[PDB]
Amino acid sequence: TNFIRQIIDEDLASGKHTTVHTRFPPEPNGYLHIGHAKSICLNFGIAQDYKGQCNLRFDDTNPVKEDIEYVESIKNDVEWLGFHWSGNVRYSSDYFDQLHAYAIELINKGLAYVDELTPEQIREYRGTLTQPGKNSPYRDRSVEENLALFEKMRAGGFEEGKACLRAKIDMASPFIVMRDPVLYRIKFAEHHQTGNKWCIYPMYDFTHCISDALEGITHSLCTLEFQDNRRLYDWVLDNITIPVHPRQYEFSRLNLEYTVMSKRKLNLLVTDKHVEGWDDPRMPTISGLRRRGYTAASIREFCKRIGVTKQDNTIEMASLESCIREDLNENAPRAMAVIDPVKLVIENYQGEGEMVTMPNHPNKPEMGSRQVPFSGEIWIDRADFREEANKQYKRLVLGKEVRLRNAYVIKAERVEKDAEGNITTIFCTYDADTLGVIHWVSAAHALPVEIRLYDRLFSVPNPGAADDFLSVINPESLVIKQGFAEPSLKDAVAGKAFQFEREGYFCLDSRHSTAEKPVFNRTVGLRDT
RNA sequence: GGGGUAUCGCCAAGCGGUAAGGCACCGGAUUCUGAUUCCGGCAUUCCGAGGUUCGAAUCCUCGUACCCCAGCCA
Ligand SMILES: NC(=O)CC[C@H](N)C(=O)NS(=O)(=O)OC[C@H]1O[C@@H](n2cnc3c(N)ncnc32)[C@H](O)[C@@H]1O
Numbered sequence: 001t002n003f004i005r006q007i008i009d010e011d012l013a014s015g016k017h018t019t020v021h022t023r024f025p026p027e028p029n030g031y032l033h034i035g036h037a038k039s040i041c042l043n044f045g046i047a048q049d050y051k052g053q054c055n056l057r058f059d060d061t062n063p064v065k066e067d068i069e070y071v072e073s074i075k076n077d078v079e080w081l082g083f084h085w086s087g088n089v090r091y092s093s094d095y096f097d098q099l100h101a102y103a104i105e106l107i108n109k110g111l112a113y114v115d116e117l118t119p120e121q122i123r124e125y126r127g128t129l130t131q132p133g134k135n136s137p138y139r140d141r142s143v144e145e146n147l148a149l150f151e152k153m154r155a156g157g158f159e160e161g162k163a164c165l166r167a168k169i170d171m172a173s174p175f176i177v178m179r180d181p182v183l184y185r186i187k188f189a190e191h192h193q194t195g196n197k198w199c200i201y202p203m204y205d206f207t208h209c210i211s212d213a214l215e216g217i218t219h220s221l222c223t224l225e226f227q228d229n230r231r232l233y234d235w236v237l238d239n240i241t242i243p244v245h246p247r248q249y250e251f252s253r254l255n256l257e258y259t260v261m262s263k264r265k266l267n268l269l270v271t272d273k274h275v276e277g278w279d280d281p282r283m284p285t286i287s288g289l290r291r292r293g294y295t296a297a298s299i300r301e302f303c304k305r306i307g308v309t310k311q312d313n314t315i316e317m318a319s320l321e322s323c324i325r326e327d328l329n330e331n332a333p334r335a336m337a338v339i340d341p342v343k344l345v346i347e348n349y350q351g352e353g354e355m356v357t358m359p360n361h362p363n364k365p366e367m368g369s370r371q372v373p374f375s376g377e378i379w380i381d382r383a384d385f386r387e388e389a390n391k392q393y394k395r396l397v398l399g400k401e402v403r404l405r406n407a408y409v410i411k412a413e414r415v416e417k418d419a420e421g422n423i424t425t426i427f428c429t430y431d432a433d434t435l436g437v438i439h440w441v442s443a444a445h446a447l448p449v450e451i452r453l454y455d456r457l458f459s460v461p462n463p464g465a466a467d468d469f470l471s472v473i474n475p476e477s478l479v480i481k482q483g484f485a486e487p488s489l490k491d492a493v494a495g496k497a498f499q500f501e502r503e504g505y506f507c508l509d510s511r512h513s514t515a516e517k518p519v520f521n522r523t524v525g526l527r528d529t
Numbered sequence: 530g531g532g533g534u535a536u537c538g539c540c541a542a543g544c545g546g547u548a549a550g551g552c553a554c555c556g557g558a559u560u561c562u563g564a565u566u567c568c569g570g571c572a573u574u575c576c577g578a579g580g581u582u583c584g585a586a587u588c589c590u591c592g593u594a595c596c597c598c599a600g601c602c603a
Contacts, residue, residue: 001542027603062602119601126599130530133599164601174531176598185601204603228532228598250533252596257539263603305551307541309534312596316539319552329565363565394563403561437561502562526564 002308004042004249008050008219020052021086021218024078025208027059028070028192030263031278032077032286034299034320035254041303042251043221044083053086055215060092061207063191071192073278077286081296092207093193095214099202100154102210102240103165103183107146111239112183113139114149115166122164125171126179132172133179139168153186156199160186167206167235175231181205209233210242217246223253224310254306255314258456259284260464274473275457276511281521282457282477292454293497293507293523298324317456321524324505328523332499333360333367336405336439337485337520339451339503340382343443346410348429349376353444356435358406372486373445374407379484384438385426387415394436396426402436405501409434439501446484450519452510453479489518497523 011017022043026036047054056078060066075089106112117125117136127133141149146165153163165184173179183206190196209232212220220233230248237245255261260269261284269275269283278285281292289299302323306315336358353375361367380396387398396402401411414427457477463469485500492498494509504525513519 025603029603059603065602115601122601123599128530128599131599132530161601166601176531179599182601187601201601203601208603224533225597226603231532252534305540307551309541311534311541313540316552319540322552325564334562362560362562392563405561407561435561436563439562499562499564502564526562528563 002251003310004219004221004251004308005046007249008046011218012050017218019218020047020050021054021216022047022052022221023055023057023090023212023215023217024085025057025059025092025211026074027062027065028067028074029062029065030070030267031073031288033261033263033266034256034284034286034289034302035261036077037081037286037299038254038303038306038308039221039223040078040081040083041300042308044078044085045303046219046221047086048083052218054083055087055090055217056085057090057092057211057215059204059208059211060191060193061202061204063187063189063201066192068192073287077290080286080290081299090211090215091193092202092211093191095207095211096194096198096202098214099207099210102242103150103202103206104147105240106167106183107150107165108143109239110143111168112165113141113146113168114153115139115164115180115182116162119161122182126176127171129176135171136166136180139180150184153184153200156186156188158186160188162186165200167232169235175228177205177228177232178235181232205229205232206236209236209246210240212246213237213242213244216244220246220248222248222250224250224312225253226250250310251308252310252312255312255464256284256320257314257316257461258458258463260458260469262464265464265469268470269457272470274470279511281452281454281510284457291509291511291521293505293521294324295327295497298327301326314462324524325527328497328499328505332497332505334358334362334501335486335488335498336372336441337449337451337483337489337500337503337506338379338381338439338441339453339481339483341379341441341484342382342385342423343425344378344380344385344410344412344428344440345425346376346378346428346430351376353442356407370488372406372488373442375442375444377443378404379441379443379446380426380438382423385412385415385423395438396436401431402438403434405437405439407435407440437502439503441484441486443484445487447487447490448517449483449485449489450510450512450517451481451483451506451522452519453481453522455479485518485520489520492518502526 024043044054116138164182166180169178171179184200279287279291355371356374358372384395408430410428412428416425459472459474466472497505497507499505505523506520510519
């Protein structure tokens with residue numbers, strides 16, 4: 001339960017409503033991010049819990065900013081998250097003829113007029129945060145004049161910016177939004193839904209409330225920056241002949257540490273090619289998190305955990321990581337893979353190889369076991385072997401022995417370095433029957449795997465606050481390593497995450513993994529202290 | 530100027546009856562993943578200062594910090 005649900009409950013109780021109807025109204029001007037998922041879980045989540053409906057409306061009132069590629073990705077992400085919308089996908093465009101008629105009503109009611117104030121002039125007349133604005137010299141045109149002018153506008157008789165339809169409210173209002181807000185503006189641009197049928201388009205504030213009313217929304221849930229806007233929202237509905245009046249409620253938006261959360265900034269990363277694309281695994285986008293290896297479930301849990309309030313907030317990366325770790329820890333089958341390989345040949349080994357038993361999950365034997373090949377020539381992580389120090393160091397020491405995961409106990413006795421001093425191979429000896437722990441991969445039965453290690457996209461906790469957020473990008477956000485994995489991963493498919501032993505959770509796809517060279521994204525490493 | 534928010538490192542319950550929970554952090558027990566699990570600990574005070582009441586994070590007063598609004602964007 002949260003404050004929004006309490007209002008809903010109170011309404012149901014008081015009999016103000018008998019059903020709940022919400023909506024998720026994104027603008028198709030970019031892809032969705034973890035922030036939009038908060039909105040998605042709030043709106044769709046509420047609807048299904050109260051046995052109600054929730055629409056997926058595309059607020060497409062600004063053609064020049066929107067694109068068809070975006071509507072498709074938004075639809076994909078919502079479905080991927082596991083939510084279904086009521087009826088067909090709605091579009092603000094669907095109400096264009098309707099909005100137009102309503103504007104005409106306002107005009108006949110003397111509550112809207114066509115303004116000739118240039119785009120610069122309108123601001124000059126608008127006033128400031130401390131000084132009231134002033135009435136336009138065109139504000140008193142007759143109803144007939146405005147009617148003609150609006151049609152002139154619609155008919156495309158005016159050039160872009162040469163005129164606009166504004167609401168006649170109060171230029172001396174403390175709410176800057178109520179100072180004769182523009183209802184319509186001229187844009188001779190093709191619309192992705194209505195083609196070139198329109199040259200004038202409705203503004204967000206005029207559109208949004210009427211869209212909600214027509215769809216019969218009971219609770220329009222948006223973020224805090226629209227609190228001022230509610231005044232206009234209510235003004236519009238209170239001044240037109242519309243049978244319902246949905247109520248707007250605002251909750252604080254999500255902010256994630258080390259990443260930016262605005263389509264504007266995210267779009268810049270894509271446009272400047274600083275990331276592969278919107279779906280890049282470093283991106284805080286849904287598709288990006290998806291390609292990164294995050295489960296829709298883990299994301300819904302995150303939204304559940306972060307809550308819904310009116311307090312500004314910035315969630316730490318550790319919270320999101322905990323969610324995906326919880327899920328994957330419980331479901332992802334374990335395996336063997338080496339990021340920094342160094343050959344470790346057991347000189348004590350006779351033959352070509354054998355096959356050992358390994359649980360698909362150590363704490364869950366019901367998940368089964370597999371048969372992984374063992375040999376005299378294996379691969380191990382360079383971070384596992386050390387000729388020196390600390391009693392705490394549980395891994396392979398130059399004078400000690402270490403248990404190989406689900407296998408025998410080796411014991412390094414001789415190492416082989418090179419000209420720069422780098423070790424090429426570690427000669428060891430295995431115990432006949434012995435079945436610190438370390439993972440490994442048989443050199444003979446080894447699958448050439450490309451491993452991509454991701455990290456925080458930005459060097460600072462609040463990159464959005466940087467003067468040039470781009471200059472603070474982490475150069476090590478992506479570190480492509482080449483390693484070896486057990487032959488099992490040969491049959492690994494994109495979509496499933498395997499937990500590489502002692503390294504983290506990984507998954508195929510990467511948008512690069514082929515048949516010869518499989519690419520694996522590190523969804524997230526394991527907890528290490 | 531108007532609109533909002535102040536509770537642990539980060540989130541968040543709380544709605545006159547005596548500070549939940551999560552993430553995180555500090556200990557101890559297990560583990561063939563330094564993982565998992567696992568028991569034990571972690572705000573005598575809620576932005577500050579007065580006031581009210583038997584009792585206040587909750588009510589009252591004055592202050593303070595931060596966030597949003599001057600697109601023909603959403
Ligand atoms: N009344 C409204 O919600 C405005 C609708 C507008 N088309 C709009 O905001 N479009 S949008 O594409 O920008 O986003 C759609 C929804 O997502 C919410 N949102 C956007 N960023 C968010 C964030 N960081 N955290 C939480 N919610 C966030 C918007 O409020 C909107 O409901």
